[PDB]
């Protein structure tokens, strides 16, 4: 409580390699963060053991109260998580998910709608930024500084102030943020199945 009040609070709602990748990056950048998911704080012991100096495992209800909430869970897991909070006013939600079908791994048919627009409707009041969905966990987990350039993270969203705040986080983590603009603008380029996903670039 008194620890967090002098900084923007970040929560990783994370599981698997991506949750761990984010924890690793926060730790390397010495940015305090909390982490949670549906399986509870105990299930995140692997993360705690490696990154507990900068990333603290908490209950989901607590993590969902942070200034910036990063949804690094499967796309299908989002609805059941975010429905637990009724008013998202004053918060930023970062959609890091990709809507992918199993077992063929093709982009989901969402009837033309953008996945992050659908997520946005599940968090009314929140300012949503689309980011951290573009890189494989193994790339995200790595040191973003490669001598002659910083690893690029594209972001987008309808609220310029929220985009800025997430760009600030991205820069602080050592990555190079590139703000593509609105969710409409990023739809055909940053969504799963589109040219900027899984593309490793550096800003020199």
TrEMBL record:
Residues 10-98 form the Pyrroline-5-carboxylate reductase catalytic N-terminal domain. GO terms for molecular function: oxidoreductase activity. It comes from the Bacteria. The keyword Ion transport does not apply. InterPro entries: NAD(P)-bd_dom_sf, P5C_Rdtase_cat_N, STEAP_metalloreductase. Signal peptide: none annotated. Keywords: Oxidoreductase, Plasmid. The keyword Iron-sulfur does not apply. SUPFAM superfamilies: NAD(P)-binding Rossmann-fold domains (SSF51735). This is Pyrroline-5-carboxylate reductase catalytic N-terminal domain-containing protein. It comes from Rhizobium meliloti (strain 1021) (Ensifer meliloti).
């Amino acid at each position: 409580n008194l620890y967090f009040q002098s900084m923007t609070t970040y929560a990783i709602i994370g599981a698997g390699a991506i949750g761990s990748a984010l924890a690793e990056r926060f730790t390397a950048a010495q940015i305090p963060a909390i982490i949670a998911n549906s399986r509870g704080p105990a299930s995140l012991s692997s993360v705690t053991d490696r990154f507990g100096a900068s990333v603290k495992a908490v209950e989901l209800k607590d993590a969902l109260q942070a200034d910036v909430v990063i949804l690094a869970v499967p796309y299908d897991s989002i609805a059941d998580i975010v429905t637990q909070v009724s008013d998202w006013g004053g918060q930023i939600v970062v959609d890091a998910s990709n809507a992918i079908d199993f077992p063929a791994f093709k982009p989901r048919d969402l009837g033309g709608r953008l996945s992050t627009e659908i997520v946005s409707e599940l968090v009314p009041g929140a300012k949503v930024v689309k980011a951290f969905n573009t890189l494989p966990a193994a790339v995200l987990a790595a040191d973003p500084d490669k001598g002659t350039g910083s690893r690029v993270l594209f972001l987008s969203g309808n609220h310029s102030d929220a985009n800025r705040q997430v760009a600030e986080l991205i820069s602080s983590l050592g990555f190079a943020p590139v703000d593509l603009g609105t969710l409409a603008a990023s739809g055909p380029i940053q969504q799963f199945g589109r040219p900027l996903v899984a593309l490793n670039l550096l800003k020199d």
